[PDB]
Amino acid sequence: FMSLFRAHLVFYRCALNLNSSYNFGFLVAMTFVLQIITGITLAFRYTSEASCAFASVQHLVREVAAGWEFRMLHATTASFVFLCILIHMTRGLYNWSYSYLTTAWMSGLVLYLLTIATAFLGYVLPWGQMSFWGATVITNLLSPIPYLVPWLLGGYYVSDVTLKRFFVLHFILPFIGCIIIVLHIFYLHLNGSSNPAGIDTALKVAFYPHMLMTDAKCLSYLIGLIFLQAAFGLMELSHPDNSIPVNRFVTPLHIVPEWYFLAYYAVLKVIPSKTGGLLVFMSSLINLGLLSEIRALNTRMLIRQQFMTRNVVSGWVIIWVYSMIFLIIIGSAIPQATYILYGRLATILYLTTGLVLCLY
Amino acid sequence: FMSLFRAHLVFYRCALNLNSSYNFGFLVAMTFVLQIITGITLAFRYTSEASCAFASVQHLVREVAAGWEFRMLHATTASFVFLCILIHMTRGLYNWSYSYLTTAWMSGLVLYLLTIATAFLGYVLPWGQMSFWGATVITNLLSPIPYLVPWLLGGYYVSDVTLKRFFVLHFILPFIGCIIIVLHIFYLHLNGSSNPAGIDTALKVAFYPHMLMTDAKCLSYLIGLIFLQAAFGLMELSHPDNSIPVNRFVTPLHIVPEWYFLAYYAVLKVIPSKTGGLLVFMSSLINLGLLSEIRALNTRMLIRQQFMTRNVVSGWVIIWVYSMIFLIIIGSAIPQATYILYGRLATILYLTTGLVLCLY
Amino acid sequence: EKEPPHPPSYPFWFKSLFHSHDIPSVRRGYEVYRKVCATCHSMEQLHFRHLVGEVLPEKRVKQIAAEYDVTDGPNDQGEMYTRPGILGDAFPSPYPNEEAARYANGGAYPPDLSLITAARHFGPDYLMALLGGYRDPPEGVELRPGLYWNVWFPGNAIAMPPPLMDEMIDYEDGTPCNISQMSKDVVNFLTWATEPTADERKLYGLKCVSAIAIGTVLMTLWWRFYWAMYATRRIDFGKLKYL
Amino acid sequence: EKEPPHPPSYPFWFKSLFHSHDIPSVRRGYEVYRKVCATCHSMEQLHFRHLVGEVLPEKRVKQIAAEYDVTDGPNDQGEMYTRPGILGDAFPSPYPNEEAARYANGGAYPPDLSLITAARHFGPDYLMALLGGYRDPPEGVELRPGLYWNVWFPGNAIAMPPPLMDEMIDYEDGTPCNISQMSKDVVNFLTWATEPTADERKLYGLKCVSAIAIGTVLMTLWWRFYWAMYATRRIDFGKLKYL
Amino acid sequence: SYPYYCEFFVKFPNYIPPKDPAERLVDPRQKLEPGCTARCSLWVNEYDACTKRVRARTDNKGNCSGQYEELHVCIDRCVAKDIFKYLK
Amino acid sequence: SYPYYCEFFVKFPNYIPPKDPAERLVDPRQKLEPGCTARCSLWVNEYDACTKRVRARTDNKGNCSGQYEELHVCIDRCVAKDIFKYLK
């Protein structure tokens, strides 16, 4: 396999005008590696038994040498997984990368859904108040689908049997993801990568050493920022209620999931209908997938350069980004008629921008 | 990967005189598959917590629908894993397959050690009397090596922390084995398989359909015998003491491991010295590995045909087989001076036969 | 030491591939456990609901459960209380902890009998022989109080007194009682209690092993179908001999 | 409802990257817990051995543990007994179960304070403000017995009576006691008790983040070393211009 | 790991009704023991002979556990052949 | 998931010794409250004015919780600026 290693990581030729916007695929991969290493290590001392799960995490931190380091690194790195993915996807929408890298885009979307499901499974394991009540709610939005809920839990409620099986699935899915990363890379190197200017060019150079040293430089920043946050606690990435034991007969005063799920949780909150809110979920994913066939949606021949430079009409991806930020604020607020009004305003922009990306 | 599938499982050419002695590699592979399927299923309801492990297995059998089937299939199939491997290895020693299939032999030996370690880890999980006291003993034979014991357990005794980590290792090692099976097959198809007569020949035919239907026929017998034993209990493959809860201050009257570990446990029991008994363990493995270089140990050119047919001097592999059977009987007996005398007689044959296989 | 003697093979109905448990005898053995063995032995894995529809009918099991006093709580004031038993409760235990059990039996612990026929060699045959193996000691062996001589117990010296004697309980179905009858019945009950899924397991195996066997015959024919075209093949060197 | 007010930022020493816990104040806050808060609140995750070499010396911790009566057993007769405490024991709890706690506090449950500064928004600043926020009710709000008005507690109505009052205990180091002093001290103790590994964590991070930063500079130089050979490259079409 | 292990070629007997129902109030082992005691007489004599050798020794050593165990094992195996014929 | 979150640019104060040790037996909040009450006077008047409007209504409805909460929050924030200067 060493001829494959040198063909794809040493002698592979790349355009000279690459920059840091093309380095975040490597960073995501490295976050998976770090999670697998720290995750397996945590598994040696975790207990899936509901009556003792919450206690096994605390005892791990308070009694075991270096136990605090593996627990806090696993929690912090999870946040960096989703930040890197977000920047990774936004580059593609800025450069219309899916125009000719079609199966790379689709394979990526599957990886995104796999990572969402993995993170949701992991957040239930510590078995605090937010673990229990967040799983109860998010698993009810899927109620319109018949009998899709009572079986995944194996009971009449998020009981102790659900926790045992969420542990096994959480263990397994990341390694399946590693298989799909191989397909992702297959579809990319089939066509070759694009560049920031959106042109064909013969001014290319080998990956090693020029481009390999840019990936290495970015890795340093990632490791330093993870350890900075992990060891000092500068930002508030976790909710305090998950430091409280589960109580099935007392709901917390404010239920909100992790930040990387907040925006779409707000969209589903401002739509009163429960069935209409789930249809909105499918339409959004369908729109992202349809971009793989953007060449065929109009007979005019497209170009990769979108001309956002010095342009006062901006671009649709930029307008989406600010609508997402606006909804993260709404999702973190107490329900109030005024918040609901503006939340619906932003939801329209959040959805319309996706649809018009298929037009040109 | 479909061109690899048709090249190696459809159009691959094989000698016409193959028979059932060449079908047990497929059967071992199928036993791994069955174990992975049933193992993962058992993991959804198993508890590694020492204080509740033993109870979680019983509740699984007594309360859960079809719980008896997955528990008994996993236990029975483990015995068939070792029976198939034994027949698989014996064919090679009868035909001197390692003469030219050198790296196939070595890779196989690594797979054998991986399977031994996996089975030992799994037998401790149900956490009965034999689980605890068999691990305590077998982990003391490794005492001559300094500090190789107190760390694998993470405590001063086979405590509750050892059980948590044996679960993770047991989960992982089988999938590593699946990786090494790929290497095993790489080294085999590099040279091509041998045949019962030990000659070169151009009378070959394609794998599909002629040879593929022999593998399928043998699979039927395997599935039928596993279910026969699993659902009716004709043979006694497990010890009754493991149906008793652990007691750290009461040793059972007769400590004996599973049948597939008995013979070498008897060899180590008739040798009084503890350091000399472990050296005997290394010498045996070293002898098996050295057979990969049998061509070089004498300047005379070897042949694959060993001429056991109608021969009154028999062959060394046959003499070994009966010495192994003789020791399984000694290992299952109460210590007595007379048993010890004959056990030493057989141990000499058990070891000498290995050494003389390197002579010709 | 020496190897203990192998117990004899008694013809229990369940020993055949095609046979089920003998439920009339399982019922009588449950009376023997409740009125004799339960005074010293627990069966902590069994619950009253396990008996319904498999050994006794529902209304009869309720009456048995209600005859016991079970601890429950805590109440609104954080205190414990007692109440009659229900189908969801476990078989009552005679002692709270193991230390209390030994204190009442001269330092010996009566083991839990939830998996007893799976936890001894030869299982039910051993239990039948044990229960009728008490004898007077041989010449030269003197035992101190609290120990008794038994043919089949390892070492011969056991701390359980002879639990059975002729005429001591009245079966409900009218079967005359004697030491041998009670032994056979209590063994059947304890074998069922070790694994109540035995009948479901055996009936499913008959359907499966028979199906698989038939498919094995069909695959044998399909293999020999392809074997014959190359086993009957002719290859000639130089010139053609026969057509 | 509405969003509760954000508490003010008090200058606790530990809030800086380069700072540790203030141990003299942690010691005084442990006296406040033992003599005031422990009457209604448990800290079930803390053990006496956690205090040794980090807050108090060993011989002093033994004296504190021995002043309590701890339940242990079972004994040889299968009974329970009491004995003085040892370093291995957990902080004693005032109630056996949650139902008994509510019964003694008018139906309200005093929460366990083992992770309290990690279990509320803004953490220690909230706890400091809470303890000094009891006021008389405003015009138009009448509360029934068992409830009290507090500026910072969500909803304003809390079931805990004012726990602190000036002059009530005598510190051992001579520091004069008042409501504000006790509040600052008890907050420091409870912040340490929420995670005693905070000082080890911060000191290791300084060594690590500084090392990684230096390596980031070196890798930047190594990258620009290779960037310059292609950024200064000349390519001419047709004919050669300059050397 | 099984409650029992199934067997081949087991002879399941037919129940023998009694004459008076009150007859089976005594253990029916008493009817079969005499006949079974005569067939194991080879061990009845080895036990009686070992008692004399022990009663004659001067020191206080020796026992007859070995011969005693073999004797009563022989009898129990003879009773098992037919005991279930008289049990419901 | 953290006991506290570290902050930048915190002013750690210097302790102000008293004149008589017996002076600090009373809460030093009393010395700072008057000055802090004058700086939040904009809310002292909104509260006193809302009481009159409620005392005059005929029905038994209305309260002053809103203005009361804002007033005392202003004062607590003023005290926090200097309270630790007088605590060991």
Ligand SMILES: CCCCCCCCCCCCCCCCCC(=O)OC[C@H](COP(=O)([O-])OCC(O)COP(=O)([O-])OC[C@@H](COC(=O)CCCCCCCCCCCCCCCCC)OC(=O)CCCCCCCCCCCCCCCCC)OC(=O)CCCCCCCCCCCCCCCCC
């Ligand atoms: C001394 C005293 C103290 C002071 C000193 C300082 C002290 C502090 C310490 C020292 C600090 C400095 C040390 C030296 C640093 C040297 C290195 C350096 O300069 O680095 C810059 C350097 C820039 O790269 P480059 O190759 O030079 O140029 C790339 C081009 O810019 C790419 O451009 P392109 O044209 O090729 O590609 C087109 C497009 C392609 O797209 C992309 O590349 C991807 C998308 C880029 C945009 C990102 C935003 C979208 C994502 C939103 C995320 C939302 C988060 C959700 C949570 C919200 C919570 C509320 O990209 C863009 O459009 C990029 C331009 C974006 C401009 C954004 C403008 C913002 C305007 C804001 C207006 C606000 C108005 C309101 C004001 C109100 C108040 C008045 O980046 C690196 O070297 C990266 C190293 C680190 C790797 C990342 C590891 C950490 C991951 C987390 C952070 C993620 C963001 C990281 C940046 C990403 C850039 C793409």
Ligand SMILES: CCCCCCCCCCCCCCCCCC(=O)OC[C@H](COP(=O)([O-])OCC(O)COP(=O)([O-])OC[C@@H](COC(=O)CCCCCCCCCCCCCCCCC)OC(=O)CCCCCCCCCCCCCCCCC)OC(=O)CCCCCCCCCCCCCCCCC
């Ligand atoms: C109707 C009323 C009722 C009655 C009817 C019956 C009712 C019952 C049901 C119906 C039963 C019959 C149904 C029809 C059956 C049709 C199929 C059939 O005939 O099958 C035979 C057929 C034979 O294959 P073949 O292609 O015809 O011929 C191959 C040549 O024989 C290969 O020879 P080669 O020359 O090409 O290769 C050379 C060498 C290459 O080496 C190998 O192939 C490997 C090694 C072979 C030897 C195996 C033994 C070594 C392993 C020992 C294991 C120890 C276990 C440890 C535990 C011990 C516990 C104490 O192999 C040999 O040397 C093989 C010859 C071995 C002869 C053994 C002689 C034993 C003598 C014993 C003397 C005893 C003296 C004392 C007496 C005291 C009392 C007086 O095999 C199959 O079709 C296999 C189907 C099943 C697959 C296996 C799945 C189950 C796995 C567990 C069983 C493992 C053993 C299975 C046999 C392995 C054979 C290699």
Ligand SMILES: CCCCCCCCCCCCCCCCCC(=O)OC[C@H](COP(=O)([O-])OCC(O)COP(=O)([O-])OC[C@@H](COC(=O)CCCCCCCCCCCCCCCCC)OC(=O)CCCCCCCCCCCCCCCCC)OC(=O)CCCCCCCCCCCCCCCCC
């Ligand atoms: C008429 C009305 C009009 C109104 C208009 C209004 C709008 C105005 C326009 C729009 C403006 C906004 C536009 C959007 C913004 C972005 C625009 C943009 O693209 O800018 C281009 C501008 C230039 O791009 P570039 O030239 O390509 O350089 C970027 C390369 O990637 C750099 O490549 P490199 O990475 O290879 O670095 C090369 C260079 C270094 O390059 C630089 O340093 C350049 C940085 C920018 C310098 C800016 C200087 C400005 C002052 C004037 C110029 C100076 C005098 C020059 C004299 C020249 C004489 C010949 O290396 C060296 O020189 C040797 C090694 C030294 C560097 C290594 C430093 C390591 C530090 C420790 C690392 C620790 C790891 C993390 C551990 C955890 C945390 C501690 O890029 C930036 O400046 C981006 C900066 C990104 C910083 C990210 C991190 C920030 C962290 C903040 C922490 C919190 C601080 C809070 C404050 C208080 C702290 C105490």
Ligand code: HEC
């Ligand atoms: C108290 C008077 C008891 C009654 C009533 C019963 N059993 Fe018991 N049993 C008791 C003791 C003290 C012991 C320990 C014996 C020893 O020497 O350790 C036992 C043991 C058993 C066993 C285990 C035998 C073995 O091989 O380990 C069994 C299977 C058993 N007892 C069964 C049993 C039955 C069926 C009873 C009702 C007929 C019964 N016991 C009553 C104490 C007492």
Ligand code: HEC
């Ligand atoms: C009994 C007289 C108590 C004493 C003494 C102390 N506390 Fe307490 N506490 C008590 C009750 C009944 C409650 C519940 C209040 C409610 O309305 O639910 C509490 C609550 C707390 C809390 C939680 C506040 C929150 O935001 O949920 C804390 C942080 C707390 N108490 C701290 C505390 C301290 C520091 C004490 C000693 C100074 C103390 N309490 C004493 C009952 C009683």
Ligand code: HEM
């Ligand atoms: C585990 C998750 C992922 C990993 C490990 C990964 C990895 C990578 C890597 C290493 C590259 C090449 C370097 C780079 O351009 O950054 C790349 C490119 C690319 N990825 Fe990802 N990716 C992931 C998720 C995604 C997602 C979610 C999408 C889109 C929905 C996506 C779409 C693309 C595209 C279109 C490219 C080519 C960009 C171009 O050349 O213009 N990937 N990916």
Ligand code: HEM
């Ligand atoms: C992309 C990969 C992964 C992601 C995104 C992820 C995410 C998470 C998250 C968010 C948590 C909850 C943290 C908390 O709030 O306490 C968690 C916990 C956990 N994860 Fe992971 N995980 C990943 C991989 C793995 C793997 C591969 C394993 C094991 C093989 C693992 C084992 C665990 C365990 C045991 C816990 C419970 C401990 C705890 O909650 O701190 N994780 N994971």
Ligand code: HEM
């Ligand atoms: C070659 C592959 C494997 C072998 C030889 C093997 C062997 C064993 C053995 C001998 C036991 C003890 C059975 C008993 O006496 O109760 C066991 C238990 C167990 N194994 Fe496996 N195993 C394999 C694969 C796996 C895998 C891949 C998993 C999970 C991913 C797994 C999960 C378990 C669990 C949860 C138990 C405990 C339940 C029990 O003891 O019945 N096994 N295994």
Ligand code: HEM
């Ligand atoms: C998981 C364990 C194993 C698997 C799945 C496996 C699989 C296979 C398969 C499918 C074949 C070809 C078909 C056949 O000849 O049966 C084969 C051949 C072979 N195997 Fe294995 N094997 C395993 C273990 C071993 C071991 C333990 C050894 C020796 C120590 C070994 C040595 C060989 C050799 C020498 C051959 C070639 C035989 C010949 O062509 O003469 N393998 N193996």
Ligand SMILES: COc1cc2[nH]c(C)c(-c3ccc(Oc4ccc(OC(F)(F)F)cc4)cc3)c(=O)c2cc1Cl
């Ligand atoms: C134009 O540029 C973009 C458009 C984008 N559009 C969409 C629709 C998404 C997206 C996909 C899946 C997803 O998964 C979900 C998890 C959780 C849920 O439910 C709940 F409640 F939040 F947990 C719902 C859903 C959440 C969000 C993006 O990431 C996205 C990113 C960029 Cl850059």
Ligand SMILES: COc1cc2[nH]c(C)c(-c3ccc(Oc4ccc(OC(F)(F)F)cc4)cc3)c(=O)c2cc1Cl
């Ligand atoms: C000539 O033909 C043959 C020679 C053979 N020689 C040897 C030495 C082995 C062998 C290898 C490893 C092994 O692993 C061990 C597990 C457990 C232990 O220890 C204990 F106590 F048993 F658990 C020791 C060891 C046990 C046995 C064979 O299989 C073998 C097979 C054939 Cl056909």
Ligand SMILES: [Mg+2]
């Ligand atoms: Mg087009």
Ligand SMILES: [Mg+2]
């Ligand atoms: Mg040679």
